[PDB]
Structures are given as C-alpha cells and as structure tokens.
Amino acid sequence: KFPRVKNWELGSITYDTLCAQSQQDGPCTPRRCLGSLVLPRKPAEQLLSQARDFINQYYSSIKRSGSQAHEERLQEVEAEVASTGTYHLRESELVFGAKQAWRNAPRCVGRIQWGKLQVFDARDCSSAQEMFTYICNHIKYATNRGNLRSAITVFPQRAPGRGDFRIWNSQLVRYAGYRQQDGSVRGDPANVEITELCIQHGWTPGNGRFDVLPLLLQAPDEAPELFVLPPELVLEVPLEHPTLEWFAALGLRWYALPAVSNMLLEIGGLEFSAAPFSGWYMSTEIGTRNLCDPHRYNILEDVAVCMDLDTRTTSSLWKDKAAVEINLAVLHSFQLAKVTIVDHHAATVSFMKHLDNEQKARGGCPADWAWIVPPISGSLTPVFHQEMVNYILSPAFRYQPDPW
Amino acid sequence: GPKFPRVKNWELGSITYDTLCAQSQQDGPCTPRRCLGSLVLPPAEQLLSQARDFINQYYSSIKRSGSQAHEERLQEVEAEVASTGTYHLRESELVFGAKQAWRNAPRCVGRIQWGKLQVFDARDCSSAQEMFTYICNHIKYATNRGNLRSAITVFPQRAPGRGDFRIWNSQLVRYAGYRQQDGSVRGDPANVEITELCIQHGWTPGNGRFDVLPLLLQAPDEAPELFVLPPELVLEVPLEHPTLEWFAALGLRWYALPAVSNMLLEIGGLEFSAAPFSGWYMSTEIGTRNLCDPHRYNILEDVAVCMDLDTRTTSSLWKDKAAVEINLAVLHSFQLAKVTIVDHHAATVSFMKHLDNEQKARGGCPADWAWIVPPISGSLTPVFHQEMVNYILSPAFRYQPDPW
Numbered sequence: 116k117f118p119r120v121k122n123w124e125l126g127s128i129t130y131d132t133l134c135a136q137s138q139q140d141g142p143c144t145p146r147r148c149l150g151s152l153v154l155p156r157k158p159a160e161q162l163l164s165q166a167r168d169f170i171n172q173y174y175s176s177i178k179r180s181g182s183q184a185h186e187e188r189l190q191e192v193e194a195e196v197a198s199t200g201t202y203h204l205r206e207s208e209l210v211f212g213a214k215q216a217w218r219n220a221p222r223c224v225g226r227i228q229w230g231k232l233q234v235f236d237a238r239d240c241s242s243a244q245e246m247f248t249y250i251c252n253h254i255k256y257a258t259n260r261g262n263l264r265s266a267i268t269v270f271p272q273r274a275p276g277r278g279d280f281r282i283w284n285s286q287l288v289r290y291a292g293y294r295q296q297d298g299s300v301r302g303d304p305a306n307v308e309i310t311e312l313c314i315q316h317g318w319t320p321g322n323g324r325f326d327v328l329p330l331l332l333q334a335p336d337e338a339p340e341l342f343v344l345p346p347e348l349v350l351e352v353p354l355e356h357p358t359l360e361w362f363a364a365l366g367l368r369w370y371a372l373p374a375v376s377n378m379l380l381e382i383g384g385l386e387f388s389a390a391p392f393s394g395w396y397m398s399t400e401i402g403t404r405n406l407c408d409p410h411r412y413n414i415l416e417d418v419a420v421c422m423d424l425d426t427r428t429t430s431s432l433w434k435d436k437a438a439v440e441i442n443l444a445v446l447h448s449f450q451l452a453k454v455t456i457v458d459h460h461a462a463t464v465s466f467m468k469h470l471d472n473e474q475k476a477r478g479g480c481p482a483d484w485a486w487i488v489p490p491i492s493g494s495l496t497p498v499f500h501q502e503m504v505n506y507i508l509s510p511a512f513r514y515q516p517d518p519w
Numbered sequence: 520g521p522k523f524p525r526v527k528n529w530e531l532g533s534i535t536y537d538t539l540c541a542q543s544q545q546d547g548p549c550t551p552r553r554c555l556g557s558l559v560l561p562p563a564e565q566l567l568s569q570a571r572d573f574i575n576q577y578y579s580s581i582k583r584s585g586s587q588a589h590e591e592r593l594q595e596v597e598a599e600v601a602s603t604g605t606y607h608l609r610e611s612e613l614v615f616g617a618k619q620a621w622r623n624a625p626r627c628v629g630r631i632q633w634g635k636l637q638v639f640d641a642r643d644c645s646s647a648q649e650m651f652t653y654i655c656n657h658i659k660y661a662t663n664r665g666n667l668r669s670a671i672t673v674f675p676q677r678a679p680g681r682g683d684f685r686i687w688n689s690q691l692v693r694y695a696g697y698r699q700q701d702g703s704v705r706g707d708p709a710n711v712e713i714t715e716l717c718i719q720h721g722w723t724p725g726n727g728r729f730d731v732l733p734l735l736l737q738a739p740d741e742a743p744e745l746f747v748l749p750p751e752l753v754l755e756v757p758l759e760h761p762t763l764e765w766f767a768a769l770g771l772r773w774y775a776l777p778a779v780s781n782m783l784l785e786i787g788g789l790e791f792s793a794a795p796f797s798g799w800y801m802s803t804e805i806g807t808r809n810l811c812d813p814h815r816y817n818i819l820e821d822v823a824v825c826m827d828l829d830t831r832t833t834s835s836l837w838k839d840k841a842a843v844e845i846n847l848a849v850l851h852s853f854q855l856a857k858v859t860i861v862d863h864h865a866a867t868v869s870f871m872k873h874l875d876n877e878q879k880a881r882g883g884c885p886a887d888w889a890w891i892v893p894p895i896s897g898s899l900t901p902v903f904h905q906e907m908v909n910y911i912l913s914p915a916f917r918y919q920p921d922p923w
C-alpha cells in the first residue's frame with residue numbers, strides 16, 4: 116500500500132506512508148491515470164468526523180493530545196454541531212488550518228515557506244465595503260514595499276441558510292483583457308470574462324494592455340459590488356533586460372503580488388469560500404506562462420524578431436532563445452526594483468529540501484509532478500528527476516464554481 | 520455529458536472524450552486515493568482470452584470481423600493452445616501487432632509515424648551468432664546511411680520450459696562507462712553495469728568518453744556470447760555549433776540510431792523478449808538528457824564556462840542558456856551531416872496531429888504527459904497544454920527484468 120518513490124539522479128528511495136491519511140478520492144483509477152487533468156470532473160454525522168479529525172490534528176501539533184483542553188474542545192464542537200448543525204473555529208485553530216492547507220497543496224513549489232504565513236482573521240465581516248478594507252490591508256501588508264511576506268485573509272465561512280462571501284476576481288491583481296472587433300484581445304486573454312463582468316457592473320474601461328482591473332466583491336445574496344484598488348497599493352515592476360536595451364521599449368510590466376482569490380479553503384469540514392492568499396512569484400510564472408503562452412500575451416515572436424532570430428523554422432530554436440531572455444528580464448527587473456522573486460532553479464532546490472523535511476516529519480509529501488516541474492528547462496532542475504505521489508490531504512485549498 | 524474521461528486543451532479550448540480507455544485490459548499503478556503516474560516503473564486459460572482479443576483486433580483492422588476466416592482463425596488458436604499450451608502468429612498478424620504496440624506506447628511522442636515501421640521477422644533464429652547477423656542487418660537497413668528508417672526485428676517468442684532469447688544491452692548502441700578508482704565515471708554513467716558485464720565475459724576495454732560497447736547476446740539456455748559491431752555499421756555524428764567555434768573542440772559526439780533492445784513485445788499473450796526496435800532521435804534526447812543530466816555526461820557547467828556565463832548564481836540562467844546552445848548544436852550537426860533528427864517543436868506539433876487522427880480513428884490515445892512534454896521549453900510546446908489519459912493497451916512494449 117506504500118509506494119516506493121525514487122530520485123533518479125541520486126538513486127535514493129523513500130516510501131510514502133502519509134498517503135494513507137488521504138480520505139478524498141482524486142480522479143485516477145486502476146484502469147486509467149488522469150493526473151494531468153487541471154480540474155476534477157466535479158451533512159451532520161460527517162462534518163462531525165472531519166471536525167474531530169481536524170481538532171485532533173491541532174492538539175497533536177501543539178503536543179497536547181489527550182490532554183484536558185483537547186477533550187473540552189471536542190465537547191465544544193460536538194455540542195455546537197448537535198444544536199446548530201455547524202461550528203466555529205478558534206482563531207489559533209484557523210491559523211493552524213491555514214498553514215496546513217498550504218502544506219498540503221500538492222501543486223505548490225514554494226511550500227518550504229509553509230510555516231511562515233501571516234493569518235488575517237476577517238470573519239467579522241458583514242459587507243462588500245469591509246471585505247475591501249480587509250483586502251486593502253492584506254495587499255499593503257503582503258506587499259511590504261517589495262520585501263514580500265506570505266499572507267492569507269479569511270472571510271466568514273459558508274453557511275447552510277444563505278449565499279457565500281466571494282471574490283469574483285481570480286486574482287487580487289489582474290490586467291484587463293479587451294475583446295476587440297476582429298476577435299483579437301488587447302491585454303490579458305485570461306481575463307476576458309472578468310473584464311466584461313466589470314464593465315457590465317458599471318466599470319469605465321481603459322485601452323491599455325496592462326490596465327489594473329477593479330475588484331468585484333460579493334456579500335451573501337447581494338449583487339456583487341465593484342471597488343477600484345488604489346494605484347498606490349498595487350506595486351508593479353517595469354520589465355527590462357540587463358543587455359538588450361530595446362527590451363525596455365516594448366512597455367512590458369508585471370505586478371509584484373500574486374494573490375489567489377477564487378479558491379475555497381477547507382478546514383475540519385468548514386468551508387471558507389473567500390480566503391485570498393499570497394506569497395511571491397517564481398519568475399517562470401511571469402516570464403514563461405503569463406508572457407509566452409500563445410493564449411496569453413504571446414510575445415515570443417515579437418522578442419525573437421527584435422533579437423534578430425530566424426523565425427522561419429523551428430530548428431533554430433528561436434522560441435527557446437527568446438523565452439530565456441524574457442525570463443532573464445523578469446528576474447533582472449525584479450532584482451533591480453528590489454521586489455521579491457525566485458527563479459525556478461532556486462525554487463526547485465528549496466522544494467527538494469522541503470520533501471526531505473516532510474519525509475522526516477510526516478512520512479511523505481503530496482506532490483503533483485506536472486505542476487511542480489517548471490515550464491522551461493524542466494530536466495535541468497532536480498524535481499524533474501524525483502518521482503512524486505499525489506493525493507488529497509485536509510486541510511486543503513480546493514477549486515470552487517464561479518458565482519455567476 | 521458522457522461518462523468517459525473528458526479531455527481538454529487549454530491553449531485552444533477544445534474538448535474530447537476518450538472512449539478508447541474502455542478497451543484497456545490491464546491495470547496501471549493509480550487508485551482513487553493516490554496518483555502514481557510519475558513513477559518510471561510499476562500460463563493456462565489467461566493466454567486464450569488474451570489471444571482471442573488480439574485476433575479480434577487483427578480481423579477488425581482488416582475489416583473482416585465476423586467472417587469465416589476470423590472464426591476459423593479463432594478455432595485454430597484454441598486448438599493450438601489446447602494441445603501445446605502456446606500458439607504462433609501468422610506473418611501479417613506479427614506486422615500488425617508490432618505496429619499496434621508502437622501505436623499503444625504512451626510514452627512515445629513519435630507515434631505520427633506508427634504506420635511506417637519495417638518489421639523484419641527473425642522467429643527462425645536459433646543461435647547467438649545468428650542474432651548478431653539479424654541485428655547487423657537491422658542496423659544497416661535502419662541507418663540507411665543517415666536517411667533513417669523505423670524498424671523492428673522479432674526474435675523467437677518465449678516457450679514453456681526453454682530459456683528466452685535476450686539482448687543484454689539496453690540499446691544496440693551504448694557508450695562505455697568506466698568506473699574510476701577516484702569514484703567518477705569516464706564516458707556514460709548510465710552504462711556502468713553493462714560495461715562491467717561486458718568485461719566479465721571477456722571484452723577488452725578501451726578508455727575514451729565514447730567507446731561503443733559490444734553486444735551481449737543470449738541464445739536460449741546459453742550464457743551470453745559477445746559480439747563487436749563493425750565501426751562502419753555504427754553511424755556517429757560529431758557535434759559542432761553553427762556560431763560558437765570552440766564547441767567543435769569539445770570533442771562531443773552521439774550515435775545516429777536509437778534502438779531499444781531490452782523491452783518485451785507482447786501480443787495476444789505471446790511474449791517476444793528480444794525484439795529490438797529503432798526510429799530516429801528527437802534532439803532533446805541527446806542535447807538535454809544525454810549530455811546535460813547530472814547523472815550522465817553532465818557537460819552543462821563546462822559549456823557555460825566556455826560561454827563565459829556567470830556559473831555562481833542560479834539567476835543568471837546559465838543552465839538554461841547553455842542547454843539551449845547544446846541543443847542547437849545537436850540539431851545543426853545532425854542536419855549538416857544528413858542524419859535524420861527532429862526538434863522538440865516540430866515533433867510535438869505532429870504528436871498533436873497524431874492525437875487528432877487517433878481521436879477520429881479509435882476515440883482517444885494513451886499518453887504519458889511527463890514523458891510527452893520535452894525536458895526543455897515544456898510550455899513552449901503544444902503538448903504542455905493538452906490533458907492526456909494514460910492507460911495500458913495490448914499489444915504492448917513492456918519492461919522486463921535484466922537477465923542477469
């Protein structure tokens with residue numbers, strides 16, 4: 116039942132015993148592996164057992180398991196659930212749950228950081244207006260003038276008798292995508308839909324490719340409300356190249372803070388539909404995906420041409436050459452602007468360190484090989500060469516449907 | 520929708536369902552609780568049922584399903600299995616099954632070519648000297664002075680009681696790896712075991728980085744005999760750069776013919792333990808894995824130093840830049856030399872065509888994403904964004920225990 120897992124560079128071998136504590140099925144069966152799929156196809160007595168489970172996790176972690184407080188806390192949960200069908204987490208438990216859900220995130224290469232997360236309790240929130248205020252303090256704290264600090268902010272749990280608090284935007288900072296006459300897109304094509312919903316709910320659009328979108332925030336069973344982030348909070352890094360001086364001409368820029376805003380956080384059976392969290396970028400996310408995917412800004416040809424590369428033929432590897440300059444430019448420009456970033460070499464090295472830690476601490480580490488291995492130079496990094504077991508542990512960030 | 524895996528391309532936004540997976544008659548390593556698809560590695564009546572299925576496939580492939588010939592061939596196999604425990608394939612059943620195994624191989628990006636495979640029958644082979652003759656013929660035909668041609672040679676199947684035919688070497692062509700007294704390896708480290716095996720059976724070793732191993736060939740129930748390949752039969756390419764002149768002085772080379780000799784070819788339950796097969800390289804096999812893996816030639820640092828790159832910090836992207844140029848050097852030199860090769864861009868483009876043909880032809884295609892995605896410039900190729908379903912179909916190429 117316990118997989119042999121091998122590193123092929125170093126010949127080293129471990130066994131995952133941690134997977135045994137997974138109790139949510141993934142999409143694979145013995146007939147066919149489905150691990151490369153981005154999304155899944157996708158309660159009285161049972162919320163109860165996830166709660167015991169989780170409270171157990173919490174008291175084991177402060178090394179006070181089977182102590183008195185443990186018992187009296189299990190009794191709280193029971194009594195609360197028996198009468199109301201639900202319960203509430205103490206602030207310190209939430210803090211524990213939030214860090215554990217990062218820890219369990221199998222798609223995340225930055226997990227070495229997991230124990231260092233600033234947790235904002237925003238459960239005493241009753242309006243879109245307040246969410247905005249909480250969302251602003253988060254951006255301000257996490258951004259920290261370029262010296263970035265991981266942070267999550269947690270809005271009120273989902274409740275049986277009403278709508279969810281939701282942030283409609285997929286990220287706290289997004290560039291407008293304007294769907295043009297000839298069906299081309301000025302700006303980020305990833306953000307066409309959200310851009311149109313913002314216009315639909317009253318927003319005045321610009322005509323740049325890097326227009327910072329407003330936030331569409333929704334309090335339960337209310338029309339979402341629109342807030343313009345103040346430009347002074349959203350820090351942005353102009354893109355240039357250490358030697359290629361025309362690179363600066365291309366007006367390229369990315370924003371400092373990668374803050375995911377549409378995922379749901381699950382802890383001990385409670386669900387937190389709005390709980391944005393942020394760290395700092397690994398440079399390939401910007402330099403390779405956001406700028407080079409052909410269904411994003413798709414700037415590879417432009418760059419290659421400016422680099423005077425023979426475009427005609429795949430075999431001159433013009434794609435590979437320009438991709439590498441753009442990634443260098445993202446690192447260069449971030450290090451200049453003194454904004455926190457990490458390259459895929461440093462990041463995957465530190466990730467290797469994390470597997471070793473997690474092997475000593477828990478007996479394994481859930482890991483999604485296709486998301487961990489970077490999008491350029493995969494086998495140049497040590498994770499390419501490391502087998503990994505993937506599986507769902509709770510607490511967990513999960514995808515959730517879009518509100519509209 | 521339908522309950523078959525839904526499969527999405529994130530670049531194009533297109534959806535398909537894989538119905539082919541229902542044909543899978545074998546379990547991979549995944550289960551609902553944990554994905555294991557990144558792991559490199561995993562007669563009685565069971566023969567009969569395997570045989571009936573292969574034969575049904577053959578007759579559908581020739582559009583004669585249900586015909587008298589079909590049920591008479593069924594009848595035939597059942598009698599032969601019933602009185603000898605095994606059975607033999609007709610010639611063109613062997614050609615079909617061979618092609619079908621390549622067609623079925625989830626790890627092969629080259630399957631647009633699956634239709635064009637020269638199948639040499641060698642089931643008459645009765646000695647290790649003769650194996651050698653067939654391999655030399657195979658190598659000559661396949662290499663065809665640089666204009667390479669895919670081919671497989673099929674030695675006699677396994678039989679109850681009697682020993683297997685086996686090619687000990689993992690590939691027909693392998694460079695020696697000599698273990699130094701100081702702990703390093705000279706040559707190719709992947710081939711240390713097979714080098715030291717060749718010496719034990721009496722080969723006189725050389726001392727270069729690129730010495731061609733002799734073949735260790737095992738006729739049934741005999742110790743393996745040793746055979747040296749005439750140098751004129753082994754086409755090799757010296758590596759040089761179109762613009763960095765010093766690259767040629769590095770003395771690097773690779774062989775033209777990728778020919779796998781250690782796999783088992785399975786058909787209707789019959790097992791061909793020696794059926795080596797060969798195509799042509801994708802440039803990233805040579806330039807990225809074989810030359811740059813840390814556990815292989817590991818020339819990345821030497822090359823970056825020659826390029827005058829900053830090798831003391833990850834963030835100069837020194838690894839990425841050196842890898843690109845080594846890869847350019849691979850293509851350029853094979854091109855200059857009129858030896859067939861394909862780059863990871865063209866190759867993945869055409870595997871996308873192959874997926875689309877197979878969708879129409881059979882309703883899906885088993886594909887191992889981690890192996891289909893090239894090991895440099897992943898997300899720069901269209902397979903990066905294509906979800907894929909991996910499962911096992913027969914005929915199959917399969918791994919087998921080394922015979923020592």
Ligand code: HEM
Nearest residue numbers: 217220222223224225228265267392393394395396397512
């Ligand atoms: C501190 C710096 C961090 C870095 C460099 C990092 C790195 C990454 C990267 C490169 C990805 C792949 C994303 C993509 O391809 O778009 C990712 C995914 C993810 N990260 Fe992080 N991470 C960091 C911090 C965090 C934090 C603080 C959290 C939560 C508190 C987090 C949770 C996640 C989750 C849930 C995913 C999966 C995303 C999805 O499925 O859409 N990470 N991480």
Ligand code: HEM
Nearest residue numbers: 621624626627628629632669670796797798799800801916
């Ligand atoms: C025609 C040109 C071909 C190209 C460019 C090609 C390309 C590739 C590549 C890049 C790999 C992965 C190599 C690695 O990671 O080491 C591979 C694997 C494979 N190919 Fe091909 N292929 C070709 C022809 C063939 C032929 C003729 C056959 C057999 C009839 C074949 C069967 C396989 C199998 C079974 C694997 C997986 C081997 C393993 O799991 O170790 N391919 N192919």
Ligand SMILES: Cc1cc(N)nc(CCCCCc2cc(C)cc(N)n2)c1
Nearest residue numbers: 153373375377378392393394395396397
């Ligand atoms: C299918 C899908 C759903 C979703 N919610 N999000 C995505 C991509 C989100 C990008 C996650 C980016 C990130 C997040 C964090 C916390 C750090 C960092 N460096 N990068 C894809």
Ligand SMILES: Cc1cc(N)nc(CCCCCc2cc(C)cc(N)n2)c1
Nearest residue numbers: 777778779781782796797798799800801
């Ligand atoms: C553990 C292991 C076993 C095995 N049989 N093979 C491997 C890698 C073999 C490399 C396959 C190379 C190849 C084969 C063919 C036929 C064409 C082409 N371009 N490349 C690893």
Ligand SMILES: C[C@H](O)[C@H](O)[C@H]1CNc2nc(N)[nH]c(=O)c2N1
Nearest residue numbers: 151152153485486903904905906
């Ligand atoms: C289809 C495929 O699973 C998908 O493109 C994944 C591959 N790996 C990834 N890895 C990361 N980090 N981010 C991604 O968006 C993707 N995309």
Ligand SMILES: C[C@H](O)[C@H](O)[C@H]1CNc2nc(N)[nH]c(=O)c2N1
Nearest residue numbers: 499500501502557558559889890
């Ligand atoms: C651990 C991981 O599965 C392993 O390194 C695989 C990854 N993908 C690969 N892909 C190909 N084509 N060849 C390989 O040898 C590997 N190695």
Ligand SMILES: [Zn+2]
Nearest residue numbers: 143148549554
């Ligand atoms: Zn799987």
